Curated annotation (Swiss-Prot):
Quaternary organization: Interacts with SLC4A4. Interaction with SLC4A7 regulates SLC4A7 transporter activity. Interacts with SLC26A6 isoform 4 (via C-terminus cytoplasmic domain).
A GO molecular-function annotation: cyanamide hydratase activity
Protein name: Carbonic anhydrase 2
Gene it is expressed from: CA2
Entry keyword annotation includes Transcription: no
Catalytic activity: hydrogencarbonate + H(+) = CO2 + H2O; urea = cyanamide + H2O
Cofactor annotation comment: Zinc. Can also use cobalt(II) with lower efficiency, but not copper(II), nickel(II) and manganese(II).
Cofactor: Zn(2+); Co(2+)
Organism name: Homo sapiens (Human)
One GO CC term on file: cytosol
Regulation: Activated by X-ray, histamine, L-adrenaline, L- and D-phenylalanine, L- and D-histidine, L-His-OMe and beta-Ala-His (carnosine).
Residues where substrate binds: 195-196
Entry's pH dependence statement: Optimum pH is 6-8.
Site positions for Involved in the binding of some activators, including histamine and L-histidine: 89
Amino acid sequence: HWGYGKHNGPEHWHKDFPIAKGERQSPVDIDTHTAKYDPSLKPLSVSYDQATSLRILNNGHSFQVTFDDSQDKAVLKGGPLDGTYRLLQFHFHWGSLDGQGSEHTVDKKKYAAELHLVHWNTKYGDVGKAVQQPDGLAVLGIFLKVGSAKPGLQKVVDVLDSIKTEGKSADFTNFDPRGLLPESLDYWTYPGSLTTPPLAECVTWIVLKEPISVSSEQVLKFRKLNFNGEGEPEELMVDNWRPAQPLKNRQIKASFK
Ligand SMILES: [Zn+2]
């Protein structure tokens, strides 16, 4: 399959997924002097108090925490969105060194990692239908910088030993994703795509201005996960990020001055 190596990485993906060269691919560089302040953008509404996490799993390209999305329990509304989007999963992208790892960049600056909270539009009934629609998904992107530890991340860090290799999963209940959010919800937004295959152009991106800080010890434990399955030669799971794609005929909007 596809991956992040020399022989199967992002520069190869277009051969199996020709939309890789499409008109609204992600991630992009956010040029802060070209982003347009839009006063008609409304504040984000993040309602996660009733979130029910289920499992954590190594899927061979990242690790994901999955949630119960059978009811409106953890939802994202407002901002640039119409209607209600349910939280499905979150996952990360990170680097081998602290100056790389994020997918979006800000004035070409890379962060050490990027957190994606993936939500789908309830009017389409299930997430599979939503991926077929230009407004089907909303992904909330949060940058990680290395500094002080993030206490709300430690429960994720401490379970990573149990999902070291591809295909492993573990029970991961009662995790509160509100502990991963920055203080401010100011954001940029633009229409884009999934950043992994199938690279579907179905995503409203909401990228928060304020990074969260995590400690060197916390990010170091991300870098000990494996791309390989158990009993295979060890390949560290690092640099699972797609490089920035051409902005083409799109405008990035900012919620703030
Ligand atoms: Zn992602």
